[PDB]
Amino acid sequence: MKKRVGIEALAVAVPSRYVDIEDLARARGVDPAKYTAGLGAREMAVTDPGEDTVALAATAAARLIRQQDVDPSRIGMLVVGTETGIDHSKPVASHVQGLLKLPRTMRTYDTQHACYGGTAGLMAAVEWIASGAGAGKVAVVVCSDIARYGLNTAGEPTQGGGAVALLVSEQPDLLAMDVGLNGVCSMDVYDFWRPVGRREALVDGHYSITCYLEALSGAYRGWREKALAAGLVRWSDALPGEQLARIAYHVPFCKMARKAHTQLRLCDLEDAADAAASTPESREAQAKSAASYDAQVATSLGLNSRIGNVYTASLYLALAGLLQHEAGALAGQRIGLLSYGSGCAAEFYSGTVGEKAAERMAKADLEAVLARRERVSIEEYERLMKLPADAPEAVAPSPGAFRLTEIRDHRRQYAEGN
Amino acid sequence: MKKRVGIEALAVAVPSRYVDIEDLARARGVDPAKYTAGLGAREMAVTDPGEDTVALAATAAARLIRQQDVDPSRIGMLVVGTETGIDHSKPVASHVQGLLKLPRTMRTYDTQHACYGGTAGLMAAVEWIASGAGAGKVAVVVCSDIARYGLNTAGEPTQGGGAVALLVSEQPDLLAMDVGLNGVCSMDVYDFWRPVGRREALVDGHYSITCYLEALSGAYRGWREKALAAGLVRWSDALPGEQLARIAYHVPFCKMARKAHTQLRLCDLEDAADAAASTPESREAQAKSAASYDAQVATSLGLNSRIGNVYTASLYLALAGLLQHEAGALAGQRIGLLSYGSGCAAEFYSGTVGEKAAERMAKADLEAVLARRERVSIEEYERLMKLPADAPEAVAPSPGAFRLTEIRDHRRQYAEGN
Ligand SMILES: CC(C)(COP(=O)([O-])OP(=O)([O-])OC[C@H]1O[C@@H](n2cnc3c(N)ncnc32)[C@H](O)[C@@H]1OP(=O)([O-])[O-])[C@@H](O)C(=O)NCCC(=O)NCCSC(=O)C[C@@](C)(O)CC(=O)[O-]
Ligand SMILES: CC(C)(COP(=O)([O-])OP(=O)([O-])OC[C@H]1O[C@@H](n2cnc3c(N)ncnc32)[C@H](O)[C@@H]1OP(=O)([O-])[O-])[C@@H](O)C(=O)NCCC(=O)NCCSC(=O)C[C@@](C)(O)CC(=O)[O-]
Numbered sequence: 001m002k003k004r005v006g007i008e009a010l011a012v013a014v015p016s017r018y019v020d021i022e023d024l025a026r027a028r029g030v031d032p033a034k035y036t037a038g039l040g041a042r043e044m045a046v047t048d049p050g051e052d053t054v055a056l057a058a059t060a061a062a063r064l065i066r067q068q069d070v071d072p073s074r075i076g077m078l079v080v081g082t083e084t085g086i087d088h089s090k091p092v093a094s095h096v097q098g099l100l101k102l103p104r105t106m107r108t109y110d111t112q113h114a115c116y117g118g119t120a121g122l123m124a125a126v127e128w129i130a131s132g133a134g135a136g137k138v139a140v141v142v143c144s145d146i147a148r149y150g151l152n153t154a155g156e157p158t159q160g161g162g163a164v165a166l167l168v169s170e171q172p173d174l175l176a177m178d179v180g181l182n183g184v185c186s187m188d189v190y191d192f193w194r195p196v197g198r199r200e201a202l203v204d205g206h207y208s209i210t211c212y213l214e215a216l217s218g219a220y221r222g223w224r225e226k227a228l229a230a231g232l233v234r235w236s237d238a239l240p241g242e243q244l245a246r247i248a249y250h251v252p253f254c255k256m257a258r259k260a261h262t263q264l265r266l267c268d269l270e271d272a273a274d275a276a277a278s279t280p281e282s283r284e285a286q287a288k289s290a291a292s293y294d295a296q297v298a299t300s301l302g303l304n305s306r307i308g309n310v311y312t313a314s315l316y317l318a319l320a321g322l323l324q325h326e327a328g329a330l331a332g333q334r335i336g337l338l339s340y341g342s343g344c345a346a347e348f349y350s351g352t353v354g355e356k357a358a359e360r361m362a363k364a365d366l367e368a369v370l371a372r373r374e375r376v377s378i379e380e381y382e383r384l385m386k387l388p389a390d391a392p393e394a395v396a397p398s399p400g401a402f403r404l405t406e407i408r409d410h411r412r413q414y415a416e417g418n
Numbered sequence: 419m420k421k422r423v424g425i426e427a428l429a430v431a432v433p434s435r436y437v438d439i440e441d442l443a444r445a446r447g448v449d450p451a452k453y454t455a456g457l458g459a460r461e462m463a464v465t466d467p468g469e470d471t472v473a474l475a476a477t478a479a480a481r482l483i484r485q486q487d488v489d490p491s492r493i494g495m496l497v498v499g500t501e502t503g504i505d506h507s508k509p510v511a512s513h514v515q516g517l518l519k520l521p522r523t524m525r526t527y528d529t530q531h532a533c534y535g536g537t538a539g540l541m542a543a544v545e546w547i548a549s550g551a552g553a554g555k556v557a558v559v560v561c562s563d564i565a566r567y568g569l570n571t572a573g574e575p576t577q578g579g580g581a582v583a584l585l586v587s588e589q590p591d592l593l594a595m596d597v598g599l600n601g602v603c604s605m606d607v608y609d610f611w612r613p614v615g616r617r618e619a620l621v622d623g624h625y626s627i628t629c630y631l632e633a634l635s636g637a638y639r640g641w642r643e644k645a646l647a648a649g650l651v652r653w654s655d656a657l658p659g660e661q662l663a664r665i666a667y668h669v670p671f672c673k674m675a676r677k678a679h680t681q682l683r684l685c686d687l688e689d690a691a692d693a694a695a696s697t698p699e700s701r702e703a704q705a706k707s708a709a710s711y712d713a714q715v716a717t718s719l720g721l722n723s724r725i726g727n728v729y730t731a732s733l734y735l736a737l738a739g740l741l742q743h744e745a746g747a748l749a750g751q752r753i754g755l756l757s758y759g760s761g762c763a764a765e766f767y768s769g770t771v772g773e774k775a776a777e778r779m780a781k782a783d784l785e786a787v788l789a790r791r792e793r794v795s796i797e798e799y800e801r802l803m804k805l806p807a808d809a810p811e812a813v814a815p816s817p818g819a820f821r822l823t824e825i826r827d828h829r830r831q832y833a834e835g836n
Contacts, residue, residue, distance in 0.1 A: 085503070085506060086613070087611050087612060087614065088612040089530070089611050089760065089761065090612075091532075091761060097606050104602075104603045104605055104636055107538060107602055107604065108531060109531035109538040111528070112507070113507075113526060120525060123525070124541075124546075127542070127551055128545045130549035130550070131549045131597055132597060132598050133541075133548070133600070180549070180550050184523055184524060186515060188513060190508075195828055196503070196506065196615070198506075218523075343508040343509060344512070345527070347525065410611075410620055
């Protein structure tokens with residue numbers, strides 16, 4: 001009896017509005033090609049205060065339950081990974097539980113480590129199940145965030161917001177994860193952070209890229225050693241990482257995925273028993289292979305390019321885009337995933353796409369999620385950005401979605417769309 | 419080959435200063451017996467800004483590693499449960515990793531759900547190990563918090579601060595946990611919370627007591643059903659809960675443990691097949707049994723009464739006090755633990771105290787930890803309370819301990835005591 005654990009399905013929620021990234025460039029006196037070619041952006045989600053971390057998380061989690069016909073009483077863990085917390089004590093997960101009218105027999109809590117928080121919660125849910133404690137039950141892990149750098153900042157064109165809700169179970173139709181094979185690399189850095197009382201992040205941008213790549217290298221190498229010992233990959237005519245059908249990466253901006261994939265391949269090329277016969281120039285040229293990027297990574301960025309950085313959710317939006325179109329082809333094949341969070345930590349893990357992944361992705365109806373949005377001007381984006389966090393716009397949520405309506409006596413109030 | 423997982427050892431850190439609780443009563447025009455008898459308090463830890471969540475967590479975690487001779491390279495997870503976070507993105511766990519100069523092959527993140535956050539992280543570490551993923555490695559889970567209600571508030575006499583660091587492993591000398599038997603009960607409430615930008619908690623105090631007891635009842639009942647089915651307890655001449663050698667509870671104030679134990683016993687008395695032959699009066703009198711409280715709970719409060727509410731750490735300070743004196747007697751016996759967090763969630767779990775628990779507790783040297791503190795006046799407590807979070811006092815940390823020294827260019831700086 002082969003037991004499996006992992007991601008059974010997912011759902012996505014996005015803010016109601018977005019801007020065209022070339023409009024942002026023009027408003028900032030920037031060449032639009034810096035954003036479209038340099039960063040790989042197309043459209044940037046923008047929010048108003050009604051689209052807070054709770055509202056986006058609850059919209060995604062409710063959509064998951066409805067689209068996948070989840071029995072809410074089978075949920076034994078509800079975890080929200082976020083870096084956009086709204087209370088020091090009361091977790092987003094508790095608000096989500098209430099808004100969705102979920103029953104009582106579940107753990108609820110939030111996880112925090114920049115863009116790694118969702119992955120940390122995913123592993124906690126997976127290992128709860130794989131330990132036996134969660135046998136017979138499911139978990140819901142929601143990655144929800146709003147990425148804000150501020151007007152006229154270098155990070156501004158990488159903003160975004162939204163949520164991805166993951167169903168975790170013993171029927172992991174999207175991704176049957178290889179338990180215990182993860183690689184991890186973490187160290188205390190100040191590449192990106194956001195002190196309490198600052199609405200916008202602080203970042204040393206180029207250093208943050210170096211930190212991502214450094215942590216990726218350590219995490220990937222740790223996974224590779226375990227995968228070699230488990231017989232899942234080999235040092236052969238193909239590099240170890242080439243034996244993964246696809247690799248999905250944390251996407252702070254779309255061009256980061258190419259940088260990440262080049263670095264992963266360089267790890268193989270530098271570590272091969274015969275590396276001494278190569279040069280930095282020859283290794284770099286091979287690592288940057290357009291064929292490899294096209295085969296393993298390129299199709300994972302379609303949703304990300306239209307939304308922006310959704311912090312904890314960015315890797316899972318890449319997984320979503322990949323499986324949206326390729327789940328049937330990928331059934332039975334092993335793929336890799338690299339999660340990074342500033343501060344920092346990276347974790348690399350693998351899993352096998354399930355036979356029913358295409359079914360679960362069809363039910364997620366992702367083009368309909370993206371089609372509901374409306375474009376706004378940069379002027380309006382700026383006006384909404386300037387609103388205080390307690391001042392949601394007077395607009396109704398979409399059917400089954402949620403919005404913050406007001407804060408009254410320090411208690412946050414929400415509405416569910418009819 | 420009987421596999422075991424759970425808590426191998428613990429260490430405690432407390433702030434350098436405390437006040438006498440009767441001095442606080444006099445300063446507030448309150449009868450001191452309200453605090454000493456009504457709440458069960460003796461001494462209240464007070465902080466200055468140098469004793470932040472990071473400094474307390476790092477002090478406790480470094481002390482654990484030194485006292486227990488942990489190989490730092492065997493740590494594969496470092497999790498901080500807290501409701502006193504200091505960054506929206508960068509976790510306390512990442513700062514602890516850096517301050518302790520720990521290596522890179524570990525997950526780092528923080529968990530959040532009021533006073534339940536530490537337990538959530540403990541279960542994530544336990545289940546990482548029990549799934550097989552953490553086989554051969556250990557985890558460190560630190561519960562670190564500073565409880566602040568504010569001058570002249572009803573919650574003020576229940577303040578406190580400190581940290582408890584837990585070593586989690588396949589050699590769980592303190593508590594070999596019963597994996598998969600936990601009971602849990604959670605629901606979305608506003609009993610206690612602390613919005614971003616508020617230094618002091620908001621609380622509906624009497625309602626928070628009702629919420630604790632309600633969630634406890636559900637969590638305990640869920641554990642009891644599983645423990646009955648596993649044959650660990652029986653409905654016999656003894657109530658199910660009486661078959662636990664001891665029960666430790668989240669301690670917001672010491673008298674809360676008696677309220678909690680009475681409620682747990684009432685759950686047994688109300689649920690017994692023959693409950694119809696009793697009355698509320700007879701059940702209450704039996705539930706309130708002094709003999710049962712004295713046998714199962716009373717000795718768990720010695721540290722808590724001298725520190726105050728340490729939020730996520732309060733239950734673990736109760737476990738510490740119990741094992742400090744009774745670990746040898748408890749070896750081979752099963753005990754219960756009830757974790758509660760406002761917002762809210764409760765989880766009830768059990769485990770068996772290990773043969774070497776007394777050894778591990780002796781190495782924690784807890785009376786020395788408490789002896790290092792100094793008493794201050796209420797006037798000085800108030801002066802320190804009024805200091806901004808970025809204004810630590812100019813005092814050195816104790817040997818091997820840590821303090822925040824300053825914030826410079828939005829980066830927190832720390833010192834390690836010589
Ligand atoms: C990403 C930066 C640093 C870029 O901001 P920047 O410094 O203004 O941009 P640049 O000068 O680095 O240019 C970017 C690319 O555009 C090119 N370019 C320029 N002009 C043109 C043009 N006319 N036509 C065509 N191309 C053009 C340019 O040559 C370059 O190409 P590349 O170096 O990639 O090969 C900034 O947006 C930033 O700081 N963003 C936020 C930080 C971030 O996303 N870091 C990523 C790594 S850390 C991470 O992923 C974690 C994170 C951020 O998500 C946080 C968390 O975990 O919580
Ligand atoms: C605990 C309260 C509500 C009490 O604050 P209060 O309302 O001022 O006190 P009280 O009137 O309820 O009195 C307390 C006890 O003192 C007695 N008393 C009175 N005077 C005398 C006297 N002269 N001589 C002898 N006894 C006296 C009095 O009769 C009573 O006895 P009891 O009802 O327990 O039997 C307040 O301190 C508060 O709000 N604290 C913070 C909230 C809290 O600790 N709640 C506990 C449950 S929730 C929890 O544990 C989660 C939490 C708080 O830790 C947060 C998280 O998870 O993050």
